[PDB]
Write a protein that binds this DNA or RNA. Structure first.
Ligand SMILES: [Zn+2]
Lengths: 48, 102, 78, 93, 106, 277, 77, 92, 75, 83
DNA sequence: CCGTTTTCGTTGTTTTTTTCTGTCTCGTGCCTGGTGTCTTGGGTGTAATCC
């Protein structure tokens, strides 16, 4: 069992590495989606 | 106000369910009162008999049920703690109510 | 042999338990629960029997197996 | 006297299992409690069996069937195999 | 509601047969230890000829009805229905011969 | 055409069986009792097309999840479900075998019809089926239900209200209540469109935690775990007010904080693996 | 009185037991004790299930009620 | 091989277990392989637990095992948690 | 531990003041009591959360606690 | 000096924090008192046994082993403090 | 039981800032109302046994 838990946990290190690459990817794709010019053009929403 | 009834826990009433509604039953000197929607007032003068079921056969039911029979129907109060059975029976016998134990 | 626990028997057990209305899957659920319970108890009893070097399962094995689970039973020689 | 505990044995077992890992003092307290608890359970069940069968000796069969009762399936199988192996080799030696 | 035990011929309420079993046939039928199907197969509510026996030993009727070795009480001259083949074989295993009280066998 | 079909949501307060027809640019449900209770669904407006056979169910289902909501009777809906129901010792075992035949018959017919809908769409619509073996129990609304993954979505179709979560629209998943020996946890989906409300799935059994984490990783969805139910009504309104400042300060990548960052431990006893007396 | 028929329960017990050791014998009192314990257990479980069902403001007991009762007891993980 | 542990290839003390079984009021007599069998079982179980505790401490990038890792190991193993379902772990 | 160490100590002493007057306590007795109490309460809150979710709710109410203690077999 | 009504030392945040560790999102206001009573009944049941052990050993100090045995009697075995 | 060592429990004081709270608006979920359709009762009606 010890060599299988080592193997399963190395697959779990790959699981964590993927999760880290997903958080870094979304951080880069949130900074690219929103620019400082859109923040300057802030739209104030008013009750109709 | 609350009557001379005191639960095993020295409380003026007992937790019970009437159908799907959880609530509190008060044994007052002249009447049984259930204070939880729907509110139920039962005067002792209108009660024909009280039937107590502690399992209706094998297997000890931790929580027992009280069926109050009166001239207009019956009300089953369920999920009463078994420790409260003797105080309730002795009080109802003291008020002149006919208690039946299946 | 698990179909021998018919629907009326489960209904009877629920009525003695105070149950007013019963779903349709309750029967299969109850059969599964009973099977698990019986599996554990009979496994313990057979362990006791094998240890006693017997081929017959006595009432003492069942009583000790229930005492093992915490389900102490009176009236069978305990 | 010097209190008895299973700490050195747990260090030995740990180094056998994880040479590059260490145990805190509190984890060793927990492990000692666990070992004592398991010993108490097994000895009590062995005594119960011996009395059930009108016997006055605890032999490896009582301990084996106690392990069969207490441990779940795979745990029981492996622990029984380990114990029988160790008893066989101690007898042989 | 009353039913007549097929084997011994006694008549008792069906719920009595289910709850307590036949006081005479329990040594070979185990009616109390039997389910409702077996109770019906050994106790029938369709019968005829209510019989009350006071003294089994000296009553010629009891000997004629072969109930002189049973508990006094309500008995039926004729009982509708017979014992099943499996129950017949089980009784024959015990060495006891079953004589039907249905009247069709005489 | 597919005959003897019930529609959800119903166009009238009375449940009536209808016939479903395939046309050139969509499908039409038509009740036999009233011509005015027609439901028309264009292929261009279907986002997802699900089929679900009677693997444990008393019912067979063809579900259309829509891009734009339709007005069926008095109700606005994104979801239109078409369904039929199977419901109506060896003899009881044989009656189960006869029910298994009736299941397989309705399954084959409704699967074939859902494939024929996909064909009529000229490749605009893929037919999806739930992976039952990957299903987990949870509470998205008010009842415990089996949530079923598909190719592209997380679904629940048996009970109303329906759950349809498109996996591609998820920005992040948060696992709430996850901590030391906990009985159950909650799962929260945040969408890429921050105007869309977050979806909660409650009471997922803790036994399914490692499976759900694996499944989210296999689908390329980032996840985070927390001991506390974070409020999203607050989180979202702040994020909607300035999405740029949110990502500037670390978005959700900083919130994740996977690094255990624990070195204090609890000291150690004299390390001595030697037999004493 | 026992609410399960005796022969079905005996057949079930023998079927289950046959998966641990062939040619096992059971005293009739063992089967009786097993039946008493099983019915007592099932009645207690049905009482807890009824309590759960009434708690949810319903009258019909459901499999989710059973699973919740068994989880709260500590029987299912 | 003087010590009885060596003659059985064990790390736990056979002699101490023998003394505790005797001076413990469990039965009139004690076998010769019951202490050996019990020591083997105990050593196996401790190794079983320490493997998973080491795994959990290595998943948290920690060199020392603390009560947290023991709690994780127990509550994450189906069989151990079933064995130890009625046990509270301090600081776990 | 979430409860502090001195209010809990005072509570324990106050409760112990009924069974024998002027009783001393030991290094690891109050700590063990606090660990057991918090573990017990966390388990009880787990069961209460399960019941509250069962009722289609998210708020735990005293009747859920009462149901949990009833099913556990607590008096 | 006698201690009087120290149950209110289980302030609202302790109970709230205990609920959050238990996974509770929204907490009714009647819970805090409920919980307090429950805890009282628990401690009174455990302490009465621990004290019973302490008094039987003819001691005057409640030791950790007394608590451990009191818990063990209720099936509340505790690892970490001895055993 | 009696003498030894020295840990950590009890005692008190100062400072920090997270938690408790007063106050407001909104909403979501608790509670009242309208409705389904099933299991079952009370009754008519046709038809009958019994003496
Ligand atoms: Zn007879």
């Amino acid at each position: 069992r010890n060599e299988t838990t080592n193997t399963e946990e190395e697959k779990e290190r790959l699981r964590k590495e993927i999760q880290k690459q997903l958080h870094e990817k979304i951080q880069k794709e949130g900074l690219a989606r929103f620019n400082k010019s859109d923040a300057q053009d802030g739209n104030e929403n008013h009750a109709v | 106000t609350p009557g001379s009834f005191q639960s095993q826990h020295m409380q003026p009433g007992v937790n019970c369910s009437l159908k799907a509604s959880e609530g509190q039953i008060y044994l007052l000197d002249k009447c049984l009162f259930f204070a939880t929607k729907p509110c139920v007032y039962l005067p002792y003068s209108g009660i024909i008999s009280v039937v107590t079921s502690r399992g209706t056969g094998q297997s000890t039911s931790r929580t027992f049920d009280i069926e109050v029979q009166f001239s207009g129907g019956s009300h089953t109060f369920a999920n009463i703690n078994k420790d409260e059975q003797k105080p309730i029976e002795d009080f109802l016998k003291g008020q002149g109510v006919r208690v039946k134990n299946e | 042999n698990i179909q021998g626990i018919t629907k009326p028997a489960i209904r009877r057990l629920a009525r003695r338990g105070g149950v007013k209305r019963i779903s349709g899957l309750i029967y299969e659920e109850t059969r599964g629960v009973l099977k698990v319970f019986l599996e554990n108890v009979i496994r313990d009893a057979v362990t006791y029997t094998e240890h006693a070097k017997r081929k017959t399962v006595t009432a003492m094995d069942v009583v000790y197996a229930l005492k093992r689970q915490g389900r102490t039973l009176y009236g069978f020689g305990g | 006297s010097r209190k008895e505990s299973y700490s050195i044995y747990v260090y030995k077992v740990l180094k056998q299992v994880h040479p590059d890992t260490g145990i805190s003092s509190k984890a060793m307290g927990i492990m000692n409690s666990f070992v004592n608890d398991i010993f108490e359970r097994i000895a009590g069940e062995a005594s119960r069996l011996a009395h059930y069968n009108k016997r006055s000796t605890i032999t490896s069969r009582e301990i084996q069937t106690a392990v069969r009762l207490l441990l779940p399936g795979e745990l029981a199988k492996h622990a029984v195999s380990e114990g029988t192996k160790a008893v066989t080799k101690y007898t042989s030696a | 509601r009353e039913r007549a035990c097929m084997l011994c011929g006694i008549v008792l309420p069906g719920r009595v047969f289910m709850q307590n079993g036949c006081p005479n046939c329990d040594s070979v039928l185990n009616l109390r230890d039997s389910d409702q199907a077996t109770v019906n197969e050994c106790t029938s509510s369709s019968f005829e000829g209510l019989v009350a026996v006071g003294d089994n030993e000296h009553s010629w009727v009891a000997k004629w009805l072969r109930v002189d070795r049973f508990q006094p009480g309500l008995y039926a001259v004729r009982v509708d229905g017979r014992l099943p083949s499996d129950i017949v074989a089980a009784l024959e295993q015990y060495g006891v011969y079953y004589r039907p009280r249905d009247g069709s066998v005489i | 055409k597919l005959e003897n079909v019930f529609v959800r949501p119903a166009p009238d307060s009375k449940r009536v069986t209808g016939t479903l027809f395939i046309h050139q640019n969509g499908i039409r449900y038509q009740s036999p009792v009233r011509s005015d209770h027609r439901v028309d669904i264009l292929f261009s407006n279907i986002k997802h097309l699900f089929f679900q056979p009677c693997k444990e169910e008393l019912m067979v289902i063809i579900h259309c999840h829509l891009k734009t909501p339709l007005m069926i009777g008095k109700k606005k809906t994104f979801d239109v479900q078409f369904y039929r129901e199977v419901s109506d010792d060896e003899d009881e075992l044989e009656q189960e075998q006869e029910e298994r035949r009736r299941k397989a018959l309705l399954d084959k017919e409704f699967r074939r019809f859902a494939e024929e809908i996909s064909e009529a769409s000229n490749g605009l619509l893929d037919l999806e089926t739930p992976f039952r073996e990957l299903g987990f129990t949870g509470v998205p609304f008010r009842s415990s239900v089996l949530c079923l993954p598909t190719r592209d979505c997380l679904i629940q179709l048996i009970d109303t209200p329906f759950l349809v979560v498109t996996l591609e629209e998820i920005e992040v998943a948060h696992l709430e209540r996850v901590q030391f020996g906990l009985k159950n946890f909650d799962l929260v989906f945040v969408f890429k469109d921050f105007s869309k409300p977050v979806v909660h799935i409650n009471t997922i059994p803790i036994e399914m935690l490692e499976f759900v984490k694996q499944w989210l990783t296999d689908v390329d969805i980032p996840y985070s775990e927390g001991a506390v139910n974070l409020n999203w009504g607050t989180i979202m309104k702040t994020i909607q007010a300035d999405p740029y400042e949110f990502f500037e300060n670390g978005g959700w990548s900083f919130l994740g904080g996977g690094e255990s960052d624990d070195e204090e431990s609890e000291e150690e006893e004299s390390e001595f693996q030697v037999s004493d007396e | 009185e026992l609410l399960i028929r005796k022969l079905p329960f005996q057949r079930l017990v023998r079927e289950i037991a046959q998966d641990f050791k062939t040619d096992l014998r059971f005293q009739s009192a063992a089967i009786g004790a097993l039946q008493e314990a099983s019915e007592a257990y099932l009645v207690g479980l049905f009482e807890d299930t009824n309590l759960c069902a009434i708690h949810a403001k319903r009258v019909t007991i459901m499999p989710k009620d059973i699973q919740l009762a068994r989880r709260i007891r500590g029987e299912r993980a | 091989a003087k010590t009885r542990s060596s003659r059985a290839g064990l790390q736990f003390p056979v002699g101490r277990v023998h003394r505790l079984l005797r001076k413990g009021n469990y039965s009139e007599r004690v076998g010769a392989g019951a202490p050996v069998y019990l020591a083997a079982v105990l050593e196996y179980l401790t190794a079983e637990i320490l493997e998973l505790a080491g795994n959990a401490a290595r998943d948290n990038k920690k060199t020392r095992i603390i009560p947290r890792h023991l709690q994780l190991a127990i509550r994450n193993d189906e069989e151990l948690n079933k064995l130890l379902g009625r046990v509270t772990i301090a600081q776990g």
